[PDB]
């Protein structure tokens, strides 16, 4: 029981294909795939690779205010299929956008991480190191050392 047309396989294979695809676009761990899934993956990388060369698209993905990457995703996903049509090309392009969204999200999430870690370091500095730093006449002490 449970072949390709079942919702279970669709979600399972879908998850493996998307995860594999995203990790694949992030090159510029891996994922476990049986033979046919691997075949599907090649039939996705080709399209991903072509889309990577669409310079205009890249600029517009870069320009998106991603204060809310989730809103962005669903607005794009909704607008894409709003005419009521489907084909594999659209599904793949949607998968392409998701992988790009990951890369974009880091580009917004990562400054945040630095500020946070900086927060800890400077908190510690103010409370634990500053007295000693003042005794050196501040950071000008380090030029000498």
């Amino acid at each position: 029981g449970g072949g390709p047309t079942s919702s279970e396989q669709i979600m399972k294979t879908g998850a493996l294909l998307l995860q594999g695809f995203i990790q694949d676009r992030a090159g510029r761990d891996p994922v476990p795939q049986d033979a046919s899934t691997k075949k599907l993956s090649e039939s996705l990388k080709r399209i991903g690779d072509e889309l990577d060369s669409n310079m205009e698209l890249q600029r517009m993905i870069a320009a998106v205010d991603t204060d809310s990457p989730r809103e962005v995703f669903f607005r794009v996903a909704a607008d894409m299929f709003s005419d009521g049509n489907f084909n594999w090309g659209r599904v793949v392009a949607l998968f392409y956008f998701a992988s790009k969204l990951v890369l974009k999200a880091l580009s917004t999430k990562v400054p945040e991480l630095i500020r946070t870690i900086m927060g800890w370091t400077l908190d510690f500095l103010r409370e634990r190191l500053l007295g000693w730093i003042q005794d050196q006449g501040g950071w000008d002490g380090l030029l000498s050392y």
Binding site: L51, M60, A78, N87, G89, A93
Partner: peptide, 16 residues
């Protein structure tokens, strides 16, 4: 702009 991206992915998807 989100929309530019949507129309372009549709166009690209359909063209494939």
């Amino acid at each position: 702009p989100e929309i530019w991206i949507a129309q372009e992915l549709r166009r690209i998807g359909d063209e494939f």
